[PDB]
Paper text:
In addition, we investigated the structure of AβUpp(1–42)Δ19–24 fibrils formed at pH 2 from synthetic AβUpp(1–42)Δ19–24 monomers by cryo-EM. Subsequent cryo-EM analyses revealed the presence of four abundant polymorphs accounting for 43.5% (PM1), 16.9% (PM2), 14.4% (PM3), and 8.4% (PM4) of all fibrils in the dataset. The cryo-EM structure of PM4 fibrils, solved to a resolution of 3.8 Å, reveals that, in contrast to the other three polymorphs observed in vitro, PM4 fibrils are composed of two copies of two identical protofilaments with a high degree of flexibility in the N-terminal domain between residues D1–K28. Accordingly, the ordered core of all protofilaments for which atomic model building was possible, extends only from G27–A42. These residues fold into the U-shape. The protofilaments are connected by hydrophobic interactions between (i) G35, and V36, and (ii) I31, G33, L34, V39, and I41. However, they all share the same C-terminal U-shape formed by residues K28-A42, which folds around a hydrophobic cluster of residues A30, I32, M35, V40, and A42. All polymorphs are different from the ex vivo AβUpp(1–42)Δ19–24 structures and different from any other published Aβ fibril structure.
The Uppsala APP mutation (Δ690–695 in APP, Δ19–24 in Aβ) is the first known multi-codon deletion causing autosomal dominant AD. Discovered in three individuals from a family in Sweden, this mutation gives rise to a dominantly inherited form of early onset fAD. Post mortem analysis of Uppsala APP brain tissue is consistent with typical AD pathology, showing abundant deposition of extracellular Aβ plaques, primarily composed of AβUpp(1–42)Δ19–24 or an N-terminally truncated form, alongside intracellular tau tangles. To summarize, we solved the fibril structures underlying the tau and Aβ pathologies in a transgenic mouse model and a patient carrying the Uppsala APP mutation, the first known multi-codon deletion mutation in the APP gene leading to AD.
Numbering used by the authors:
A (entry chain A), B (entry chain E), C (entry chain I), D (entry chain M), E (entry chain Q), F (entry chain B), ...: 29 to 42
Amino acid sequence: GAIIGLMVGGVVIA
Amino acid sequence: GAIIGLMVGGVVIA
Amino acid sequence: GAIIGLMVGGVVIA
Amino acid sequence: GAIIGLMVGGVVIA
Amino acid sequence: GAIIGLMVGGVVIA
Amino acid sequence: GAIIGLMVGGVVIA
Amino acid sequence: GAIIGLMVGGVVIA
Amino acid sequence: GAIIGLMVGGVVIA
Amino acid sequence: GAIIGLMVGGVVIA
Amino acid sequence: GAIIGLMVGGVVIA
Amino acid sequence: GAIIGLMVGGVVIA
Amino acid sequence: GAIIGLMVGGVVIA
Amino acid sequence: GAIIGLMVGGVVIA
Amino acid sequence: GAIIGLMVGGVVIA
Amino acid sequence: GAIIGLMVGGVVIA
Amino acid sequence: GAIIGLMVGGVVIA
Amino acid sequence: GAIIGLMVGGVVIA
Amino acid sequence: GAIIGLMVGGVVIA
Amino acid sequence: GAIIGLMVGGVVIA
Amino acid sequence: GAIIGLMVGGVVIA
């Protein structure tokens, strides 16, 4: 999938 | 997928 | 995929 | 893919 | 692909 | 200050 | 100040 | 100040 | 001030 | 001041 | 402020 | 302010 | 302000 | 302001 | 202001 | 069925 | 089915 | 199915 | 299927 | 299928 570090407040479907 | 660091507030489908 | 650092507020499909 | 630093507010399909 | 730094507000397909 | 509706995931200094 | 509806992912100093 | 609808990903000083 | 609809990714001083 | 619809990626002083 | 009939699910600043 | 009939799902600043 | 019938999903500043 | 019938999905400043 | 029937997907300043 | 994140004000038949 | 992020005001049959 | 980010006001059959 | 970012006001069959 | 960024008002079969 996606690779994300230190994300702020977001929305993720995954 | 996508590679993202320190993202602010976003939306990600992944 | 795409390579992104310090993104502000965006949307990503990935 | 694309290489991006310090992007403001955008949308990315990736 | 494309190389862009300090992009403002854009859209990127990548 | 600022008036905001339905802000997603943000940061606000306030 | 500013009046904002449905802002995504943002940063606001306010 | 400014009046804004549906702003994506932004930064606002306000 | 300014009136804006559906602004993408922007920065606004306001 | 200015009236704007669907502005992409901009910067506005307002 | 605002005066409303039969709005579905919305958001209002008023 | 705004006067509304039968709007679906919207956002309103008014 | 604005007067509306049968709008679908929209955003309104008014 | 604006007067509308059967608009789909739009954005309106009015 | 503007008077509209059966518009699809638009943006309107009015 | 359908997969939806952060839907505003909508209607879904499902 | 369909995959949707941050939909505003919509209708979905699903 | 379809993949959609940040859709405004829409209708989707799915 | 189709991949869509930041679609305004649309209709999608999917 | 199709890849689309920032589409305005459209209809898509997908």
